[PDB]
Amino acid sequence: TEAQARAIVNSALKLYSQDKTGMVDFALESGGGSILSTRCSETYETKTALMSLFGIPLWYFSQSPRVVIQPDIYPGNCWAFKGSQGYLVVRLSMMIHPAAFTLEHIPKTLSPTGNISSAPKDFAVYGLENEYQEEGQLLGQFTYDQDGESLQMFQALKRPDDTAFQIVELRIFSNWGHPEYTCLYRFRVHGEPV
Amino acid sequence: TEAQARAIVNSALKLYSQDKTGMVDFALESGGGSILSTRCSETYETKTALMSLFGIPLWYFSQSPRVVIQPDIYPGNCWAFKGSQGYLVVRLSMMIHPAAFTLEHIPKTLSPTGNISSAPKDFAVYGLENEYQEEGQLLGQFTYDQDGESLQMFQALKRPDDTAFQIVELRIFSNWGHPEYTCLYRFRVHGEPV
């Protein structure tokens, strides 16, 4: 069964190397996804600025929302929005029928502050026929579990019809208690292309 | 024993995914650590990595000490300081009781040169109360073993009290023989916030 052990290990490592999931991420920026930054919540304003020009302090931010569709999730490689409610609008690399979503957050064991109170908690995902659509189609309501694994996957609502989407909005309704901001490390969209 | 094998594999991959150690790195730049550049040894000067634009020689690339608190450790993603002994000063993301330190170096099996003579060998770690203190408090004296694992961890000295620090100085007292420079791939600081 030594061969069976080696097979178990190689399968687990193969899946790990395939972006941990073995599934296309249609939101991934390098693969063709993009943030529609003019439709996203405003980025959290840090207390100090990055530079000054002609005596005026400029750039009071830490990361732009692009990092939510980039795979590095070392602490701090997350997009912070103000408060505990916000939204992120993503154009996918293809028109798809969305099947599942992934949210990642750093584990508590790597958090300098001892907690992950800034992690998103209650959220929903909507499909939009275009980025200026006011009300989207609910693809699902979920909770990121602060006591669960770093990477969590969520099944899209089972749908009688097949309307494809190339734009999705992630709406965060609450976080795990941080009083100033909410941090998103990585959001993925999975499904079948049309 | 099949489920037990899966548990062992998943547990190992989980620890691996948590920055290999499952421990907060308070030196990590993305999490808020920073290099105090005026307190670091001189960087090794080399005019051999030429950047050009449209064929026009533009500038000579050399790594800065910031890469020591960045996670990438492919060969060459290291700070090279001039000579065989030097020092690096790091401001931590939080005030902590430092408990342990990690040094990583590439394994010899990946070194294009056949050896890792540029790895640090004898070193010590000191806590500094402010950025102007010369020596500080010895937190420990250690040796990075060129025949050991790529990642090595070192326990801070036990003291009757727990003095907290937000600045640590890494003093490299020797390297593994390289005649021109010493290369630091990654240094981590672990401990307990105040």
Binding site: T48, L50, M51, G76, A80, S118 | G32
Partner: peptide, 13 residues
């Protein structure tokens, strides 16, 4: 005055 400021305060994590 293209001066660069040092935050001294930790980023969101």
């Amino acid at each position: 005055p293209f001066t660069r400021l040092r935050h001294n305060g930790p980023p969101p994590v």
